[PDB]
PDB file of C-alpha atoms in Angstrom:
ATOM      1  CA  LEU A   1      -4.158 -27.303 -13.485  1.00  0.00           C
ATOM      2  CA  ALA A   2      -1.287 -29.453 -14.645  1.00  0.00           C
ATOM      3  CA  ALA A   3       0.478 -26.407 -14.181  1.00  0.00           C
ATOM      4  CA  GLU A   4       0.408 -26.666 -10.314  1.00  0.00           C
ATOM      5  CA  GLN A   5       1.925 -30.136 -10.429  1.00  0.00           C
ATOM      6  CA  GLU A   6       4.400 -29.454 -13.103  1.00  0.00           C
ATOM      7  CA  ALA A   7       5.160 -26.715 -10.906  1.00  0.00           C
ATOM      8  CA  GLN A   8       5.215 -28.716  -8.035  1.00  0.00           C
ATOM      9  CA  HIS A   9       7.563 -31.291  -9.743  1.00  0.00           C
ATOM     10  CA  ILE A  10      10.151 -28.139 -10.683  1.00  0.00           C
ATOM     11  CA  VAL A  11      10.267 -27.422  -6.820  1.00  0.00           C
ATOM     12  CA  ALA A  12      11.057 -31.439  -5.984  1.00  0.00           C
ATOM     13  CA  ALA A  13      13.525 -31.364  -8.567  1.00  0.00           C
ATOM     14  CA  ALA A  14      14.896 -28.004  -7.774  1.00  0.00           C
ATOM     15  CA  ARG A  15      15.167 -29.327  -4.265  1.00  0.00           C
ATOM     16  CA  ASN A  16      16.694 -33.003  -5.685  1.00  0.00           C
ATOM     17  CA  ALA A  17      19.583 -30.103  -7.021  1.00  0.00           C
ATOM     18  CA  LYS A  18      20.793 -28.827  -3.904  1.00  0.00           C
ATOM     19  CA  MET A  19      20.659 -32.442  -2.464  1.00  0.00           C
ATOM     20  CA  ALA A  20      22.822 -33.568  -4.574  1.00  0.00           C
ATOM     21  CA  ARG A  21      24.808 -31.189  -4.473  1.00  0.00           C
ATOM     22  CA  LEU A  22      26.033 -32.530  -1.116  1.00  0.00           C
ATOM     23  CA  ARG A  23      25.124 -35.798  -1.512  1.00  0.00           C
ATOM     24  CA  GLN A  24      27.867 -36.186  -4.414  1.00  0.00           C
ATOM     25  CA  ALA A  25      30.703 -33.410  -2.616  1.00  0.00           C
ATOM     26  CA  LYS A  26      31.224 -36.622  -0.146  1.00  0.00           C
ATOM     27  CA  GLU A  27      31.457 -38.623  -2.884  1.00  0.00           C
ATOM     28  CA  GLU A  28      34.161 -37.095  -4.896  1.00  0.00           C
ATOM     29  CA  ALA A  29      36.258 -36.230  -1.523  1.00  0.00           C
ATOM     30  CA  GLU A  30      37.188 -39.901  -2.121  1.00  0.00           C
ATOM     31  CA  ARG A  31      38.141 -39.542  -5.482  1.00  0.00           C
ATOM     32  CA  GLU A  32      40.846 -36.627  -4.827  1.00  0.00           C
ATOM     33  CA  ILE A  33      41.943 -38.718  -1.800  1.00  0.00           C
ATOM     34  CA  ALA A  34      42.414 -41.289  -4.395  1.00  0.00           C
ATOM     35  CA  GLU A  35      44.701 -39.112  -6.507  1.00  0.00           C
ATOM     36  CA  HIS A  36      46.743 -37.763  -3.056  1.00  0.00           C
ATOM     37  CA  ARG A  37      47.284 -41.310  -1.977  1.00  0.00           C
ATOM     38  CA  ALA A  38      48.739 -42.481  -5.407  1.00  0.00           C
ATOM     39  CA  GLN A  39      50.517 -39.076  -5.617  1.00  0.00           C
ATOM     40  CA  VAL A  40      52.157 -40.018  -2.270  1.00  0.00           C
ATOM     41  CA  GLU A  41      52.397 -43.918  -2.799  1.00  0.00           C
ATOM     42  CA  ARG A  42      54.582 -43.046  -6.236  1.00  0.00           C
TER      43      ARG A  42
ATOM     44  CA  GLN B   1      -4.508 -23.612 -24.145  1.00  0.00           C
ATOM     45  CA  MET B   2      -2.924 -21.254 -21.221  1.00  0.00           C
ATOM     46  CA  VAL B   3      -3.058 -23.937 -18.776  1.00  0.00           C
ATOM     47  CA  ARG B   4      -1.368 -26.395 -21.158  1.00  0.00           C
ATOM     48  CA  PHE B   5       1.395 -24.166 -22.315  1.00  0.00           C
ATOM     49  CA  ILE B   6       1.821 -22.950 -18.955  1.00  0.00           C
ATOM     50  CA  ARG B   7       2.244 -26.837 -17.652  1.00  0.00           C
ATOM     51  CA  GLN B   8       4.397 -27.929 -20.518  1.00  0.00           C
ATOM     52  CA  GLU B   9       7.183 -24.233 -19.241  1.00  0.00           C
ATOM     53  CA  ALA B  10       6.824 -25.963 -15.818  1.00  0.00           C
ATOM     54  CA  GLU B  11       7.733 -29.274 -16.868  1.00  0.00           C
ATOM     55  CA  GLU B  12      10.285 -28.059 -18.925  1.00  0.00           C
ATOM     56  CA  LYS B  13      11.490 -25.880 -15.640  1.00  0.00           C
ATOM     57  CA  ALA B  14      11.210 -29.507 -14.331  1.00  0.00           C
ATOM     58  CA  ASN B  15      13.576 -31.267 -16.882  1.00  0.00           C
ATOM     59  CA  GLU B  16      16.299 -28.332 -16.573  1.00  0.00           C
ATOM     60  CA  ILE B  17      16.351 -28.430 -12.515  1.00  0.00           C
ATOM     61  CA  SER B  18      17.012 -32.329 -12.827  1.00  0.00           C
ATOM     62  CA  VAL B  19      19.471 -31.814 -15.481  1.00  0.00           C
ATOM     63  CA  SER B  20      21.012 -28.757 -13.028  1.00  0.00           C
ATOM     64  CA  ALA B  21      21.122 -31.720 -10.415  1.00  0.00           C
ATOM     65  CA  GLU B  22      22.673 -34.635 -12.861  1.00  0.00           C
ATOM     66  CA  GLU B  23      25.523 -31.324 -13.827  1.00  0.00           C
ATOM     67  CA  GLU B  24      26.070 -30.132  -9.824  1.00  0.00           C
ATOM     68  CA  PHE B  25      26.942 -33.683  -8.715  1.00  0.00           C
ATOM     69  CA  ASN B  26      29.393 -34.191 -11.747  1.00  0.00           C
ATOM     70  CA  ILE B  27      30.467 -30.656 -10.664  1.00  0.00           C
ATOM     71  CA  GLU B  28      30.926 -31.764  -7.037  1.00  0.00           C
ATOM     72  CA  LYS B  29      32.693 -34.608  -8.940  1.00  0.00           C
ATOM     73  CA  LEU B  30      35.012 -32.336 -10.772  1.00  0.00           C
ATOM     74  CA  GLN B  31      35.505 -29.489  -7.817  1.00  0.00           C
ATOM     75  CA  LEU B  32      37.132 -32.094  -5.666  1.00  0.00           C
ATOM     76  CA  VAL B  33      39.593 -33.149  -8.581  1.00  0.00           C
ATOM     77  CA  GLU B  34      40.127 -29.265  -9.024  1.00  0.00           C
ATOM     78  CA  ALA B  35      42.752 -27.773  -6.633  1.00  0.00           C
ATOM     79  CA  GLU B  36      43.904 -30.898  -5.051  1.00  0.00           C
ATOM     80  CA  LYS B  37      47.335 -30.189  -7.684  1.00  0.00           C
ATOM     81  CA  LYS B  38      48.456 -27.579  -5.306  1.00  0.00           C
ATOM     82  CA  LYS B  39      47.210 -28.941  -2.051  1.00  0.00           C
ATOM     83  CA  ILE B  40      49.770 -32.056  -3.560  1.00  0.00           C
ATOM     84  CA  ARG B  41      52.951 -30.104  -4.524  1.00  0.00           C
ATOM     85  CA  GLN B  42      52.912 -27.951  -1.237  1.00  0.00           C
ATOM     86  CA  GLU B  43      52.179 -30.899   0.682  1.00  0.00           C
ATOM     87  CA  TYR B  44      54.453 -34.036  -0.927  1.00  0.00           C
ATOM     88  CA  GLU B  45      57.397 -32.622  -2.585  1.00  0.00           C
ATOM     89  CA  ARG B  46      57.221 -29.531  -0.700  1.00  0.00           C
ATOM     90  CA  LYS B  47      58.066 -31.844   2.557  1.00  0.00           C
TER      91      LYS B  47
ATOM     92  CA  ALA C   1     -14.417   4.729 -10.673  1.00  0.00           C
ATOM     93  CA  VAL C   2     -13.542   5.453  -7.008  1.00  0.00           C
ATOM     94  CA  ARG C   3     -13.874   3.593  -4.141  1.00  0.00           C
ATOM     95  CA  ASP C   4     -14.426   0.565  -5.111  1.00  0.00           C
ATOM     96  CA  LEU C   5     -12.857  -1.545  -3.019  1.00  0.00           C
ATOM     97  CA  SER C   6     -15.480  -1.659  -0.309  1.00  0.00           C
ATOM     98  CA  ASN C   7     -17.912  -3.235  -3.056  1.00  0.00           C
ATOM     99  CA  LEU C   8     -15.375  -5.816  -4.010  1.00  0.00           C
ATOM    100  CA  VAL C   9     -15.812  -9.665  -4.373  1.00  0.00           C
ATOM    101  CA  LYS C  10     -13.445 -10.167  -1.260  1.00  0.00           C
ATOM    102  CA  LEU C  11      -7.272 -15.459 -10.163  1.00  0.00           C
ATOM    103  CA  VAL C  12      -9.566 -12.384  -9.844  1.00  0.00           C
ATOM    104  CA  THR C  13      -8.608  -8.701  -9.905  1.00  0.00           C
ATOM    105  CA  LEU C  14     -11.055  -5.828  -9.075  1.00  0.00           C
ATOM    106  CA  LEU C  15     -13.081  -4.476 -12.508  1.00  0.00           C
ATOM    107  CA  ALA C  16     -15.950  -4.327 -11.959  1.00  0.00           C
ATOM    108  CA  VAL C  17     -17.256  -4.186 -15.742  1.00  0.00           C
ATOM    109  CA  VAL C  18     -20.438  -1.965 -15.930  1.00  0.00           C
ATOM    110  CA  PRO C  19     -21.738  -1.895 -19.698  1.00  0.00           C
ATOM    111  CA  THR C  20     -14.462 -16.116 -21.902  1.00  0.00           C
ATOM    112  CA  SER C  21     -14.381 -19.967 -22.848  1.00  0.00           C
ATOM    113  CA  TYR C  22     -11.081 -21.276 -22.605  1.00  0.00           C
ATOM    114  CA  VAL C  23      -9.416 -23.719 -21.056  1.00  0.00           C
ATOM    115  CA  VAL C  24      -8.694 -21.858 -18.020  1.00  0.00           C
ATOM    116  CA  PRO C  25     -11.485 -22.965 -15.262  1.00  0.00           C
ATOM    117  CA  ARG C  26     -13.871 -19.785 -17.134  1.00  0.00           C
ATOM    118  CA  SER C  27     -17.073 -21.645 -14.824  1.00  0.00           C
ATOM    119  CA  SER C  28     -16.983 -18.687 -12.045  1.00  0.00           C
ATOM    120  CA  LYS C  29     -19.347 -15.685 -11.022  1.00  0.00           C
ATOM    121  CA  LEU C  30     -16.999 -13.477  -8.552  1.00  0.00           C
ATOM    122  CA  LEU C  31     -19.107 -11.299  -5.894  1.00  0.00           C
ATOM    123  CA  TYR C  32     -17.891  -7.956  -7.624  1.00  0.00           C
ATOM    124  CA  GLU C  33     -21.598  -6.889  -6.412  1.00  0.00           C
ATOM    125  CA  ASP C  34     -22.608  -2.951  -5.734  1.00  0.00           C
ATOM    126  CA  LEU C  35     -22.422  -3.372 -10.886  1.00  0.00           C
ATOM    127  CA  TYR C  36     -21.215  -7.081 -11.984  1.00  0.00           C
ATOM    128  CA  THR C  37     -18.807 -10.136 -12.567  1.00  0.00           C
ATOM    129  CA  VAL C  38     -18.190 -12.027 -15.509  1.00  0.00           C
ATOM    130  CA  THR C  39     -16.627 -15.570 -16.245  1.00  0.00           C
ATOM    131  CA  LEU C  40     -12.807 -15.379 -15.649  1.00  0.00           C
ATOM    132  CA  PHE C  41     -10.084 -16.706 -14.431  1.00  0.00           C
ATOM    133  CA  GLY C  42      -6.320 -16.531 -13.573  1.00  0.00           C
ATOM    134  CA  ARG C  43      -5.178 -19.344 -14.781  1.00  0.00           C
ATOM    135  CA  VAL C  44      -5.377 -17.459 -18.344  1.00  0.00           C
ATOM    136  CA  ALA C  45      -4.519 -13.537 -18.368  1.00  0.00           C
ATOM    137  CA  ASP C  46      -6.644 -13.811 -22.407  1.00  0.00           C
ATOM    138  CA  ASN C  47      -9.730 -14.720 -20.244  1.00  0.00           C
ATOM    139  CA  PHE C  48      -9.619 -12.243 -17.598  1.00  0.00           C
ATOM    140  CA  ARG C  49      -8.657  -9.172 -19.823  1.00  0.00           C
ATOM    141  CA  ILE C  50     -10.946 -10.642 -22.058  1.00  0.00           C
ATOM    142  CA  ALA C  51     -13.396 -10.590 -18.933  1.00  0.00           C
ATOM    143  CA  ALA C  52     -12.703  -7.384 -17.499  1.00  0.00           C
ATOM    144  CA  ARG C  53     -11.221  -4.842 -20.605  1.00  0.00           C
ATOM    145  CA  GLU C  54     -10.749  -6.162 -23.833  1.00  0.00           C
ATOM    146  CA  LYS C  55     -14.294  -5.207 -25.092  1.00  0.00           C
ATOM    147  CA  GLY C  56     -17.684  -3.960 -23.796  1.00  0.00           C
ATOM    148  CA  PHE C  57     -17.795  -3.225 -20.343  1.00  0.00           C
ATOM    149  CA  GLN C  58     -14.686  -1.962 -18.849  1.00  0.00           C
ATOM    150  CA  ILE C  59     -13.177  -2.371 -15.442  1.00  0.00           C
ATOM    151  CA  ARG C  60     -13.884   0.220 -12.608  1.00  0.00           C
ATOM    152  CA  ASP C  61     -11.056   1.155 -10.687  1.00  0.00           C
ATOM    153  CA  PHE C  62     -10.286   0.469  -7.093  1.00  0.00           C
ATOM    154  CA  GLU C  63      -8.867   1.143  -4.119  1.00  0.00           C
ATOM    155  CA  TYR C  64      -5.824  -1.224  -4.145  1.00  0.00           C
ATOM    156  CA  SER C  65      -6.866  -3.093  -1.690  1.00  0.00           C
ATOM    157  CA  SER C  66      -9.726  -3.896   0.673  1.00  0.00           C
ATOM    158  CA  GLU C  67      -7.576  -3.074   3.737  1.00  0.00           C
ATOM    159  CA  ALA C  68      -7.419   0.113   1.926  1.00  0.00           C
ATOM    160  CA  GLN C  69     -11.323   0.292   1.764  1.00  0.00           C
ATOM    161  CA  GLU C  70     -11.409   0.178   5.580  1.00  0.00           C
ATOM    162  CA  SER C  71      -8.257   2.328   5.810  1.00  0.00           C
ATOM    163  CA  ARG C  72     -10.761   5.364   4.014  1.00  0.00           C
ATOM    164  CA  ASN C  73     -13.611   4.487   6.301  1.00  0.00           C
ATOM    165  CA  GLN C  74     -11.971   4.647   8.956  1.00  0.00           C
ATOM    166  CA  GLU C  75     -11.156   8.290   7.826  1.00  0.00           C
ATOM    167  CA  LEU C  76     -14.642   8.801   7.006  1.00  0.00           C
ATOM    168  CA  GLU C  77     -15.606   8.228  10.311  1.00  0.00           C
ATOM    169  CA  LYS C  78     -12.085  10.333  12.057  1.00  0.00           C
ATOM    170  CA  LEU C  79     -13.178  13.277   9.262  1.00  0.00           C
ATOM    171  CA  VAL C  80     -16.280  12.986  10.281  1.00  0.00           C
ATOM    172  CA  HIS C  81     -15.562  13.770  14.039  1.00  0.00           C
ATOM    173  CA  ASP C  82     -13.916  16.433  12.974  1.00  0.00           C
ATOM    174  CA  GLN C  83     -16.286  18.358  11.423  1.00  0.00           C
ATOM    175  CA  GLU C  84     -18.507  17.744  13.493  1.00  0.00           C
ATOM    176  CA  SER C  85     -16.224  19.083  16.262  1.00  0.00           C
ATOM    177  CA  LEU C  86     -16.142  22.352  14.600  1.00  0.00           C
ATOM    178  CA  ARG C  87     -19.782  22.402  13.616  1.00  0.00           C
ATOM    179  CA  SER C  88     -20.753  21.745  17.298  1.00  0.00           C
ATOM    180  CA  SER C  89     -17.452  22.686  19.510  1.00  0.00           C
ATOM    181  CA  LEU C  90     -15.407  24.814  17.516  1.00  0.00           C
ATOM    182  CA  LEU C  91     -18.933  26.433  16.890  1.00  0.00           C
ATOM    183  CA  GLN C  92     -19.925  27.120  20.798  1.00  0.00           C
ATOM    184  CA  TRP C  93     -16.097  28.252  21.141  1.00  0.00           C
ATOM    185  CA  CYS C  94     -16.918  30.656  18.232  1.00  0.00           C
ATOM    186  CA  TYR C  95     -20.356  31.960  20.056  1.00  0.00           C
ATOM    187  CA  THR C  96     -18.035  32.307  22.922  1.00  0.00           C
ATOM    188  CA  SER C  97     -15.744  34.174  20.996  1.00  0.00           C
ATOM    189  CA  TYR C  98     -18.595  36.496  19.561  1.00  0.00           C
ATOM    190  CA  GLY C  99     -19.819  37.299  23.051  1.00  0.00           C
ATOM    191  CA  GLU C 100     -16.419  38.260  23.837  1.00  0.00           C
ATOM    192  CA  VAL C 101     -16.714  40.117  20.712  1.00  0.00           C
ATOM    193  CA  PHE C 102     -19.810  41.771  21.730  1.00  0.00           C
ATOM    194  CA  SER C 103     -19.067  43.451  25.377  1.00  0.00           C
ATOM    195  CA  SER C 104     -14.869  43.991  23.592  1.00  0.00           C
ATOM    196  CA  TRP C 105     -17.261  46.614  21.301  1.00  0.00           C
ATOM    197  CA  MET C 106     -19.669  47.580  24.045  1.00  0.00           C
ATOM    198  CA  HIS C 107     -16.217  48.690  26.368  1.00  0.00           C
ATOM    199  CA  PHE C 108     -15.039  50.101  22.895  1.00  0.00           C
ATOM    200  CA  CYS C 109     -18.123  52.050  22.174  1.00  0.00           C
ATOM    201  CA  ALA C 110     -18.082  53.038  26.121  1.00  0.00           C
ATOM    202  CA  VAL C 111     -14.919  54.340  25.322  1.00  0.00           C
ATOM    203  CA  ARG C 112     -15.586  56.376  22.717  1.00  0.00           C
ATOM    204  CA  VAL C 113     -19.106  57.729  24.340  1.00  0.00           C
ATOM    205  CA  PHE C 114     -16.875  58.838  27.296  1.00  0.00           C
ATOM    206  CA  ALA C 115     -14.604  60.419  25.025  1.00  0.00           C
ATOM    207  CA  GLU C 116     -17.427  62.313  22.791  1.00  0.00           C
ATOM    208  CA  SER C 117     -18.574  63.688  26.327  1.00  0.00           C
ATOM    209  CA  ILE C 118     -15.554  64.683  27.376  1.00  0.00           C
ATOM    210  CA  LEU C 119     -15.305  66.897  24.523  1.00  0.00           C
ATOM    211  CA  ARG C 120     -18.450  67.919  25.044  1.00  0.00           C
ATOM    212  CA  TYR C 121     -18.264  67.840  28.453  1.00  0.00           C
ATOM    213  CA  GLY C 122     -16.294  68.425  31.638  1.00  0.00           C
ATOM    214  CA  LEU C 123     -13.019  65.916  31.329  1.00  0.00           C
ATOM    215  CA  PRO C 124     -13.445  64.283  34.302  1.00  0.00           C
ATOM    216  CA  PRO C 125     -15.595  60.685  33.502  1.00  0.00           C
ATOM    217  CA  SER C 126     -19.332  60.952  33.936  1.00  0.00           C
ATOM    218  CA  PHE C 127     -21.759  60.018  31.158  1.00  0.00           C
ATOM    219  CA  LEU C 128     -25.487  59.822  31.458  1.00  0.00           C
ATOM    220  CA  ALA C 129     -26.253  58.013  27.935  1.00  0.00           C
ATOM    221  CA  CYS C 130     -27.935  55.431  26.993  1.00  0.00           C
ATOM    222  CA  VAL C 131     -28.018  52.675  23.712  1.00  0.00           C
ATOM    223  CA  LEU C 132     -30.595  50.726  22.257  1.00  0.00           C
ATOM    224  CA  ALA C 133     -31.887  49.484  18.323  1.00  0.00           C
ATOM    225  CA  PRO C 134     -34.370  51.627  17.732  1.00  0.00           C
ATOM    226  CA  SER C 135     -36.055  51.783  14.170  1.00  0.00           C
ATOM    227  CA  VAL C 136     -35.528  54.715  12.106  1.00  0.00           C
ATOM    228  CA  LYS C 137     -38.058  56.955  12.942  1.00  0.00           C
ATOM    229  CA  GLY C 138     -37.244  55.545  16.468  1.00  0.00           C
ATOM    230  CA  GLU C 139     -33.999  57.175  15.549  1.00  0.00           C
ATOM    231  CA  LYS C 140     -35.143  60.840  14.318  1.00  0.00           C
ATOM    232  CA  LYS C 141     -37.131  60.956  17.462  1.00  0.00           C
ATOM    233  CA  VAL C 142     -33.945  60.551  19.791  1.00  0.00           C
ATOM    234  CA  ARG C 143     -32.544  63.209  17.171  1.00  0.00           C
ATOM    235  CA  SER C 144     -35.604  65.468  18.170  1.00  0.00           C
ATOM    236  CA  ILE C 145     -34.759  64.619  21.747  1.00  0.00           C
ATOM    237  CA  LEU C 146     -31.253  65.357  21.493  1.00  0.00           C
ATOM    238  CA  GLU C 147     -31.358  68.208  19.265  1.00  0.00           C
ATOM    239  CA  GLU C 148     -29.510  70.330  22.400  1.00  0.00           C
ATOM    240  CA  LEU C 149     -26.100  68.918  21.781  1.00  0.00           C
ATOM    241  CA  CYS C 150     -25.393  67.506  18.176  1.00  0.00           C
ATOM    242  CA  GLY C 151     -22.881  66.993  16.441  1.00  0.00           C
TER     243      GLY C 151
END
């Protein structure tokens, strides 16, 4: 049924949520470090 | 009928989960900026 | 009504509706036959309700799982074992107890007869009586014989 495929897509998106949070955390650490570096360099 | 409605509901749930993925990425992006001011204050001018 | 899990068909539920078309895959027939099954599918709860208890035939109650039916069968075997014990081994024990009770009653009757003789004869233990089970005319003959010493 289409319900099973839509539920599989929902599960995939739910996993992608956890993946994307962790992926964006590392990049955001760079932004935080850049703000700290600007504050220091001033 | 019921199967199609359940499929539509699960598709809406998938869309909500993808929106939550984007929201969590942006949330990490903001949270790294969040609470950095206190660390800079205790690290830079306190020093 | 009861113990219908033993005749279960093992999206479907134990109904056995004794005296359906939808988007759900109704093209199916459960094996819950002793009763009969109806076209239903778990994709739509409405179809299952219609095929089980919405109208007409009513869904029969069953043990929650077929494992409950298996446990009921095992408990039935154990209950048959216990009943057979009570009816054979405990019956032999009861027969032995009945024999012991007959022996004890005979001993008590002998003691009572000894007491009656001591009342009607010398105190030291001495008896010459007899015990049997004759007919009523036999009892009359015994009374005629023993009218010499009657109570």
